[PDB]
């Protein structure tokens, strides 16, 4: 199937004393494999999946070096952004950066991303062609021109089409027993009377991987969205995910209703009934 690698970075300025709180996480698909936290004791990039522990000391030295450089970049950014936006020293502010690559089923380059936010709003982002920038406002437009001057897009494009996909390929092989395995949802239905006249039917999907899934209700074989509640997909805590969808129905009429589940790990979709 198709796969991705993503790194996420958050810096939060700490006015009054010290450097920002900095947190960096790396993912293959929906699996976190590395982390850095400026507040943790090690001051090293740290493993978070068993299959990355294969990597030698040179890997960890190299990653620690780059990630700490990311944190310094963001430290400088927070100062610069403060001046661009005429903000005071008294407030705490946030920068966030995300980048990575997708690969198709043949594990060849599909897409690359690099995007950036200040205080939770779009700031600047690399466009799909990986050749140009989307700058949200005039502060970001000044950044756009600096980055054009410094050939940032060319440097990123080399990384996203080269290094990113090469290492993703490597991680997929090393971690194949978990990363290349699909866990189909474990499904069941529950019934909860709400009054003498109505009942909730709840359709559960448990222990699935990857996170992407579709849960829908049908009534008499037609799609039903009214009187339905769909919760956001949530981590079980063990690496897998959970979701449910619920519908309110007239009691006695439960049999008209069917729950439909689509997931990468199911050859064909599932249908549940009460």
């Amino acid at each position: 199937g198709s796969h991705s690698m993503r790194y996420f970075f958050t810096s939060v300025s700490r006015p009054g004393r010290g450097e920002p709180r900095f947190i960096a996480v790396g993912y293959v698909d929906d699996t976190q494999f590395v982390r850095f936290d400026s507040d943790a004791a090690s001051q090293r990039m740290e493993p978070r999946a068993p299959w990355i522990e294969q990597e030698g000391p040179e890997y960890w030295d190299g990653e620690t070096r780059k990630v700490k450089a990311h944190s310094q970049t963001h430290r400088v950014d927070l100062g610069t952004l403060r001046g661009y936006y005429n903000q005071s020293e008294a407030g705490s502010h946030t920068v966030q950066r995300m980048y990575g690559c997708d690969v198709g089923s043949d594990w060849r380059f599909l897409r690359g991303y690099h995007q950036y936010a200040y205080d939770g709003k779009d700031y600047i982002a690399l466009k799909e062609d990986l050749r140009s920038w989307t700058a949200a406002d005039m502060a970001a437009q000044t950044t756009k021109h600096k980055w054009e001057a410094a050939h940032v897009a060319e440097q990123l494009r080399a990384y996203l089409e080269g290094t990113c996909v090469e290492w993703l390929r490597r991680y997929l092989e090393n971690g194949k027993e978990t990363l290349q395995r699909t866990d189909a949802p474990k499904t069941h239905m529950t019934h909860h009377a709400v009054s003498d006249h109505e009942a909730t039917l709840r359709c559960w999907a448990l222990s699935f991987y990857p996170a992407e899934i579709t849960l829908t209700w049908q009534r008499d074989g037609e799609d039903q969205t009214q009187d339905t509640e769909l919760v956001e997909t949530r981590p079980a805590g063990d690496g897998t995910f959970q979701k449910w969808v619920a519908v309110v129905v007239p009691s006695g009429q439960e049999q008209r209703y069917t729950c439909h589940v689509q997931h990468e790990g199911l050859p064909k979709p599932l249908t549940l009934r009460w």
């Binding site: 950014d77 600096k146 940032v152």
Partner: peptide
């Protein structure tokens, strides 16, 4: 693996 170059200050 993380990017090195391409990650510039704003």
């Amino acid at each position: 693996e993380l990017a090195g170059l391409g990650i510039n200050t704003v």
